[PDB]
Design a protein around this ligand. Structure first.
Ligand SMILES: CC(C)n1c(S)nnc1COc1ccccc1Cl
Length: 133
């Protein structure tokens, strides 16, 4: 019942500073422009210890499945090959991605009826708000 309040189908309803986040991550111009248009569906489910997070959009479709605390390989939507570890910290899903000596952290939390995604790369934060689909 760990992540019960995350489970469901969510749709992006607002984004702030995502272009600057993508720049900081190293995403090139054309991907930033096309990716920035996308309004993804995020679909979160849990089966036993395994959490699955799917992102479906006109840009790319991605899927990760993982066990909390256990590192895995992830190919991001912008085609980075990263090593990811996701933990729960005080009710927040904390997702760290490591690649090429770099690191970014994505936090997912429930706030009111929203699922709020905070993406941080060094000094730059983007906030992406999702509501139930
Ligand atoms: C998990 C989080 C960062 N996210 C949310 S929220 N919506 N899409 C993404 C994946 O990241 C993307 C997507 C496209 C291009 C570049 C990146 Cl870095």
């Amino acid at each position: 019942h760990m992540c019960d309040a995350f489970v469901g189908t969510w749709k992006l309803v607002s984004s702030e500073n995502f272009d600057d986040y993508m720049k900081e991550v190293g995403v090139g111009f054309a991907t930033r422009k096309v990716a920035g248009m996308a309004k993804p569906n995020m679909i979160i489910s849990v089966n036993g210890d395994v959490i699955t997070i799917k992102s479906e959009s006109t840009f790319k479709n991605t899927e990760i499945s993982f066990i909390l605390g256990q590192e895995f390989d992830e190919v991001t939507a912008d085609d980075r090959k990263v090593k990811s570890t996701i933990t729960l910290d005080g009710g927040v899903l904390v997702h760290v991605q490591k690649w090429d000596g770099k690191s970014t952290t994505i936090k997912r939390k429930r706030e009111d009826d929203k699922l709020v995604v905070e993406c941080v790369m060094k000094g730059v934060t983007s906030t992406r708000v999702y509501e139930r689909a």
